[PDB]
Structure formats: C-alpha cells, structure tokens
Design an enzyme around this catalytic site. Structure first.
Site, PDB file in Angstrom:
ATOM      1  N   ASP A   9      42.270  44.911  -6.248  1.00  0.00           N
ATOM      2  CA  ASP A   9      41.690  45.011  -7.517  1.00  0.00           C
ATOM      3  C   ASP A   9      40.873  46.188  -7.331  1.00  0.00           C
ATOM      4  O   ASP A   9      40.602  46.964  -6.090  1.00  0.00           O
ATOM      5  CB  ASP A   9      40.772  43.912  -7.443  1.00  0.00           C
ATOM      6  CG  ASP A   9      41.442  42.618  -9.780  1.00  0.00           C
ATOM      7  OD1 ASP A   9      41.560  41.700  -9.286  1.00  0.00           O
ATOM      8  OD2 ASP A   9      41.648  44.384 -10.038  1.00  0.00           O
ATOM      9  N   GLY A  10      40.685  46.701  -8.622  1.00  0.00           N
ATOM     10  CA  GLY A  10      39.635  47.774  -8.867  1.00  0.00           C
ATOM     11  C   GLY A  10      38.763  47.769 -10.375  1.00  0.00           C
ATOM     12  O   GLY A  10      39.159  46.790 -11.083  1.00  0.00           O
ATOM     13  N   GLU A  47      43.233  51.347 -10.082  1.00  0.00           N
ATOM     14  CA  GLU A  47      44.085  49.685  -9.630  1.00  0.00           C
ATOM     15  C   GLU A  47      44.860  50.213  -8.419  1.00  0.00           C
ATOM     16  O   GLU A  47      44.916  49.187  -8.202  1.00  0.00           O
ATOM     17  CB  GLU A  47      43.805  49.588 -10.848  1.00  0.00           C
ATOM     18  CG  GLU A  47      43.134  48.309 -11.448  1.00  0.00           C
ATOM     19  CD  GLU A  47      44.124  47.714 -13.187  1.00  0.00           C
ATOM     20  OE1 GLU A  47      44.554  49.160 -13.640  1.00  0.00           O
ATOM     21  OE2 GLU A  47      44.259  46.986 -13.310  1.00  0.00           O
ATOM     22  N   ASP A  69      46.220  42.474 -10.980  1.00  0.00           N
ATOM     23  CA  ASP A  69      46.333  42.106 -12.160  1.00  0.00           C
ATOM     24  C   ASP A  69      45.725  42.589 -13.099  1.00  0.00           C
ATOM     25  O   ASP A  69      46.095  42.498 -14.846  1.00  0.00           O
ATOM     26  CB  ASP A  69      44.611  41.540 -12.301  1.00  0.00           C
ATOM     27  CG  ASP A  69      43.417  42.107 -12.385  1.00  0.00           C
ATOM     28  OD1 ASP A  69      42.337  42.168 -13.402  1.00  0.00           O
ATOM     29  OD2 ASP A  69      43.207  43.506 -12.194  1.00  0.00           O
ATOM     30  N   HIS A 124      43.130  35.854 -11.302  1.00  0.00           N
ATOM     31  CA  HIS A 124      42.678  34.991 -11.676  1.00  0.00           C
ATOM     32  C   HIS A 124      44.309  33.950 -10.709  1.00  0.00           C
ATOM     33  O   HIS A 124      43.624  32.613 -11.253  1.00  0.00           O
ATOM     34  CB  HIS A 124      41.643  34.495 -10.369  1.00  0.00           C
ATOM     35  CG  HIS A 124      41.154  33.959  -9.742  1.00  0.00           C
ATOM     36  ND1 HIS A 124      42.277  33.728  -8.706  1.00  0.00           N
ATOM     37  CD2 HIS A 124      40.256  33.561  -8.732  1.00  0.00           C
ATOM     38  CE1 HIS A 124      41.710  33.071  -7.270  1.00  0.00           C
ATOM     39  NE2 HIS A 124      40.129  33.181  -7.473  1.00  0.00           N
ATOM     40  N   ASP A 134      37.491  40.873  -5.719  1.00  0.00           N
ATOM     41  CA  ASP A 134      37.554  41.205  -7.452  1.00  0.00           C
ATOM     42  C   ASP A 134      36.211  41.450  -6.794  1.00  0.00           C
ATOM     43  O   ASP A 134      35.158  42.672  -7.302  1.00  0.00           O
ATOM     44  CB  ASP A 134      37.855  39.765  -7.841  1.00  0.00           C
ATOM     45  CG  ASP A 134      38.099  39.065  -9.626  1.00  0.00           C
ATOM     46  OD1 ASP A 134      37.515  38.160  -9.329  1.00  0.00           O
ATOM     47  OD2 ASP A 134      38.849  40.350  -9.453  1.00  0.00           O
TER      48      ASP A 134
END
Length: 147
Positions: A9-10, A47, A69, A124, A134
């Site tokens: 995650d970014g 990301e 994501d 998620h 996150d």
C-alpha cells in the site's frame, strides 16, 4: 522457496504531493514491514515504490504472493501494457518514453530472483494484514514536508 506474503500500500496527498508507502513481508513466523515516504510524488509511484522495496528485501528466492489495491499496477500488468514498454526500451507506441520508467525497470529487476503471482484484490478484500500496511502508508505520507 517458501511462500512469503507481500502486502502493499501507498498513500499520497496531492498531485503531486507527499506520500509514503509500506511493504509487509508476512513470513513463516514473523512480519517485517518497511515504510518510507518521499516529499512530492504520486500515488502510482508510492504504490509502485512499495511493491519493489518489498521484493528488494528478500535475498532468498521464494514463491511470493504479492497484494495491491493498485488501480495502476493492475492496469499495467493485466492489459498487455507492461509487456509492451519492456519491448520498446520503455516507450509508448505513440513514441514517447513511458512515465515512471525508473520505477518500472526497478520492479522488473526486483521480481528477478523470485516467482511472484500478483493479487489485485481491490484494497481491503484482503486480510487484516491490509490494515497494517494501509495505516502505515497513510502515516508515512502524513509525516513529511508539505513543500
């Protein structure tokens, strides 16, 4: 090998803006989470810089499950996109040098030793391990320079 579990995650706060990433390496029995942040950048790079540092930190060629994501990563890898950049010395078919090509090869270099299957679970849909990344991504982004 030995099944790793790369959650990524970014986060970023402008266009450009300050962002931070995070990579979580869910090992056999212990986690290892790497997080950095740049001052002015973009979601896509944050990301991406996330997926690469995860990989980077594995001197042991293992089967990897990667997770993101990433709107952008899922694009590039599923729609024939990246295979093409590769081919042309990182050039668009229009004839321009693909944006973010420093991170694109980077990544490729990273995957090298290992066997990563990606997992594009839209944020998620993934495991609570999602939470850690996150938050630490956000957190990183929030504790920078606003310049």
């Amino acid at each position: 090998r030995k099944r790793v579990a790369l959650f990524t995650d970014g986060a970023c706060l402008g266009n450009p803006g300050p962002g931070g990433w995070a990579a979580l390496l869910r090992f056999h029995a212990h986690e290892k989470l790497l997080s950095g942040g740049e001052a002015c950048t973009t979601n896509n790079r944050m990301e991406l810089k996330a997926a690469i540092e995860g990989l980077k930190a594995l001197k042991e060629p293992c089967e990897v499950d990667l997770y993101t994501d990433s709107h952008y990563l899922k694009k590039a890898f599923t729609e024939g996109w990246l295979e093409g950049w590769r081919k042309r010395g990182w050039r668009t078919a229009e004839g321009k040098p693909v944006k973010n090509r420093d991170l694109w090869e980077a990544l490729l270099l990273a995957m090298a030793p290992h066997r990563v299957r990606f997992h594009f679970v839209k944020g998620h849909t993934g495991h609570p391990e999602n939470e850690r990344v996150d938050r630490e991504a956000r957190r990183q982004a929030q504790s920078q320079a606003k310049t």
